[PDB]
Symmetry: D2
Subunit: 391 residues, 4 copies
């Protein structure tokens, strides 16, 4: 059973996806935001997220806009759901065909910023703490079409303005850049968790910026999602996370969390939950950015919403048991996993004492050490037996 | 090829005996003095090497000393320099779980000593860059390696190297070399971005950059030219390894331009049709490739020349591309240069932007969305330049 | 250069007609009028046009309308001299085909799918098409337990056997080309590569009537060597048609202009198709472009991209011929022993008994001396590329 | 659980015997004695051992040496009761094979390759092996112009026809299994996927004697669905043998323990093999592990890893069994209409004429209403994973 302390959130665009893919028409009718709010509260979610255009149809008058916001607000009210994050749609409308913030067309860039400032206003009114930015159209199909250097300057220029505004209006938002390697552009700028973290480090107020990595995004490049998250945590830039499934380098599948690379889903939950001193290593929302398969109807939709929560709770339970097992604890010792936490250098030791240590080189028996095994297969087999519920 | 082109090769490239994961070596060992002489002849301006490529692992000092002296004499006679040096922290069994990040504390200590030793030699030969390729840093299984602790230990080791270099006045720059996998299932710092992000966290970051390799980024299906552009933006492109690859599969290390030719073209354009008229990058054009296993030493020398030849041919077409009036017109129609103009007018902030009805309230997005960028046409002129069709 | 009708460049109506609605955004271009399409293509040099039933006649058109459209379309063909070399059927767009056409778990959908194809065969026969292309875009699954692959192959076969029967009985004279694709839109599509599709075809009742229609980008989506797969297809005599386009390895289907993805492989492919045995092309069917003008483009970009497909093919053709005609290349081919592979391993009349008696093939063979000689493959590759760059 | 001889788990001598010399480093383990390997495998529950000629008998051993080795080997087999179900030949290590064995551009290498194999068939037939596996690891190219594929397929076929001839004439009763691989060690390998190999086998003189030996990670190196290709191999009845291991998508060949790569695909694979044609195994040959103990391990890790392969197979078999015996899973299958795919699309005796006559198949078909019904695939996939997780 899911509790509000689990912090499961879903985007309105997930359960609301009508299943219009690149090769066919929608197979499901539109979902009413209010209904979405009641259904999600009912399956155990603690919050909902949305793109401006998901809640208010692009081009709605203020009267309409205002009315929609009012009803949405009531729904949250009655159900107790919160809005931990909001985002802006800078990919759908034809105007953004070459990007929002990095469109070659200057007028588009000015417009994309305005669209976002507005969404920032709504987010602050609803109490959202994080603004996620997915630059889906920032990038190119052809190398000569985009000056990457100029693009990074313009991406930077726009973000610095957004931080200025938030800080000045006192919104207290955190900004999370979401990396993606491709799709819809041939290549997207800031293709991985690594490129997004390096870019953020160059902004004016870098402490307000982090990343929102997505499981399938990193897997589209055949990268290890867990190892990437571990790196993000080391830098302290994991501001939010999108969970879903994918089967390697192919179109973005957005399957239910754990329905793609199951072994990596397990090590991920282990990383987020079996944090230092019992406690999770991560504290924000556990947000599912997935899509109910095109072959399903609304029954299938609610089922898939529950499957995400279910997968996460079953994995947590097995990650917990894994760590708690004295036999795993013995295998961990033999493989020396914790020995990596001991500094390489003795306290106060520098280059000169190290050069003076004959045991670190001149008298070191590399051949003898090179022959001892690490016992890694065995430790790995123990983990899978826990995942399989065989231990 | 001029010394000014700065083409360099690793001793281990032309010297690769072609022993692969599935077969025996098909070529005999290449003598280092010989390699220096042959590389000087093909137009290389410099040579690089791992410690163990030059001095066999475990050579006594007399031997080691002898080899260096001969090596230095060959350098002397041909006029070749040593722009970069590196350390083999991957071959010997002791490094099976990594050098700086091995779970075993004693291997970590030995790894640092092995590198300090190589720094002294590099300093001695005049090398300016120390490249570090952490090929054994990573894992096959997620529960076997604590990534957070591994980054601490990677960081602890690099801080010490810089300390030493700086106290001794060596003036070295450090370039981390990213690779997603092979030999490990997953290697730490898998892409150029992960490596740049990491370097920003060291104690003397100004001393650290990256050494991206064409093929390593392509093993993940990333755009090499686009990652180099970001590296240049951060000013962390300290060195570059050029070669060819055909997408995600084992590391092929083909001659530069024999893998993704279109990306090879846009890369030379980026590196050479720099800022002014000038190159955007001024370091060595280093070829980290392998002569195919099917070749003998005639093939080896041919493959070395092919690297230089691909670069010069692409350079020539990149220049011609940029000088074409038809290309200038296509660039003008695709608004490439408009991206260089700030989004905001000088002195404009969020308050002035919010006051501009034309940036939103009266913005005709429908009308803007209907005009084409003409990117296909621009792409077509680039390719025609590549094929010498214009 | 200039395209002639003998080059046989053809384009799908859905190619230049793609409005650019992708998985993440709305259409950026208005609808293309088919008569206009016929006219525009004639002008850029195409010798034929192809289409899906639903590209020409809107799904759910009354008989009157349908007839109306066809007759206008036939006039334009008439007027311009374009032919219809191939026709295909859309079994992927309408929601009813969400689990497939021919292999839908739902039996009623399979029956409907067959009927929809029968109808296109008739229109096809009437327009003079020689090939029926079948792209089973929704045949596959997202989850392994959801599709019995064996049963699906039975049903796939069952539907194809019937179409062959019909065509033969009506005297249509069609050939059928199955088009493989590894994924998108299904997580996994059945008959994922050219290989799997050829193996399948061999199991049909009148296999001589079935071949494949491989697409450059589909094979590359799995990182396979397109040229090598087409060489195998030709070896089997199953290349009934070909879809040309570009792709940048394993990622979503990009459908770029031919030669705008893997340029080196586009070169070797043109070389294989044209620098066939007896000087002549190894393949004589349509050179069909199944690509999409980028979403960033307007109608000018659209006609520009259509012409680019042709320009790319012709520029590569020209370099492939220069390559083969170069004496230095001839010398490199000889040192690489490329043609020695065409001489049989055994001397005429030799069998295992005579091979076993040859001490020189084993007992006295010096593997070590043979293993030391290089094949000169790098030099040969370098010469190919210099020809491609127009540097020679 | 415990492995029985009835489980038919086999290992190649080269698996537990891999010294861990990779492309970037020296071996981390000392050589394993073949007799010791027989004893150790017998002890963990294997029923058979397989080997390449060069794994048992060092390349170039004189006849007395070779004979002594074989004799000691046979004694160990005798004493442990292990059998030799398949043998193979190394046509990839020696420098002479740098451009392939059967398809080297060099004619003399092709003659030597055939003799190396014939000699191995003799030893196999004497040890009682029933299958000869052929992995053409060096057949291919790094550059397109270096290899004529058509000529290569002719030479490949030429060699294989001779081998069938010899076997049939000697009464060896061997079956031949070609093992596909997309790349590594060559940039591109001929017959890259199970599909390509099946299509090729179909062109031999005696196709009934030929099938495939597909490997889990080889198909995953192309990001293909292994279970789905296995399903197709079974449909063609060409699954002669199988190599089980683990891989993480497109990268170098990892050869991890079976189930340590794509766990979900491993699960549906065991479901297909054991519960295939309903309840009964769809495959009865060896369950062969072609894996490598990680380079980080010592001999204790090697035996642990050999045991992990068997454990993984048995755990998944148990979960696959429970999955199918679950009345809720059955109900989901019914709802998803999985079995309805097994019912012919056409009625008994119905032809195109009758089909064309059925208005319910088209004229009166409500596509729109059918298109709106959900298949319930997500729910079915969730039950499958809950079985795998032991949560049900
Ligand atoms: O591939 C789509 C991407 O994952 C998207 O769903 C974002 O997360 C959203 O635009 C911001 O939350
Ligand atoms: O994949 C091998 C790697 O690219 C290596 O050759 C490095 O470049 C070298 O160890 C540092 O220069
Ligand atoms: O990926 C889509 C596929 O390539 C399609 O365009 C087909 O070729 C058509 O359905 C049959 O011609
Ligand atoms: O990748 C190596 C290949 O998988 C090999 O192990 C073959 O199976 C063997 O040579 C035939 O048995
Ligand atoms: Co996504
Ligand atoms: Co997301
Ligand atoms: Co490399
Ligand atoms: Co390198
Ligand atoms: Co396509
Ligand atoms: Co196509
Ligand atoms: Co293998
Ligand atoms: Co194998």
């Amino acid at each position: 059973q899911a509790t509000r302390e689990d912090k499961f959130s879903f985007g309105l665009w997930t359960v609301g996806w009508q299943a219009r893919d690149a090769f066919g028409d929608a197979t499901r009718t539109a979902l009413d935001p209010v209904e979405a709010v009641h259904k999600l509260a009912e399956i155990g979610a603690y919050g909902i997220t949305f793109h401006d255009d998901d809640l208010v149809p692009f081009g709605s008058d203020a009267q309409t806009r205002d009315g929609i916001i009012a009803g949405f607000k009531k729904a949250l009210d009655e159900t107790g759901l919160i809005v931990p994050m909001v985002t802006t749609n800078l990919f759908t409308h034809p105007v953004f065909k070459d990007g929002g913030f990095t469109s070659n067309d200057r007028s588009v860039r000015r417009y994309a910023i305005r669209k976002v400032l507005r969404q920032m206003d709504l987010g602050a009114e609803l109490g959202a703490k994080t603004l996620v930015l997915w630059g889906g159209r920032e990038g190119a199909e052809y190398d000569s079409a985009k000056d990457v250097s100029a693009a990074l300057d313009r991406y930077r220029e726009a973000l610095n303005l957004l931080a200025q505004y938030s800080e000045d209006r006192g919104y207290g938002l955190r900004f999370a850049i979401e990396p993606k390697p491709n799709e819809p552009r041939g290549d997207i700028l800031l293709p991985t968790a690594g490129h997004a973290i390096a870019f953020v480090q160059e902004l004016e107020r870098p402490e307000l910026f982090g990343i929102n990595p997505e499981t399938g995004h990193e897997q589209m490049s055949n990268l290890n999602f867990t190892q990437g998250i571990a790196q993000a945590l080391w830098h302290k830039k994991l501001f939010h996370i999108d969970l879903n499934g994918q089967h390697g380098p192919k179109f973005d599948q957005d399957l239910v969390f754990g329905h793609g690379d199951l072994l990596n889903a397990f090590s991920l939950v282990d990383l987020l939950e079996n944090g230092p001193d019992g406690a999770p290593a991560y504290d924000g929302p556990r947000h599912f950015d997935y899509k109910p398969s095109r072959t399903e109807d609304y029954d299938g939709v609610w089922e898939s919403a529950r499957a995400n929560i279910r997968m996460y709770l079953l994995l947590r339970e097995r990650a917990r048991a894994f760590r708690a097992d004295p036999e795993v604890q013995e295998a961990l010792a033999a493989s020396k996993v914790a020995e990596l936490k001991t500094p390489t250098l003795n306290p106060g030791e520098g280059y000169a004492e190290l050069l003076a240590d004959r045991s670190a080189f001149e008298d070191y028996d590399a051949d003898a050490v090179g022959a001892k095994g690490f016992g890694f297969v065995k430790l790995n087999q123990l983990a899978i037996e826990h995942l399989l519920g065989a231990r």
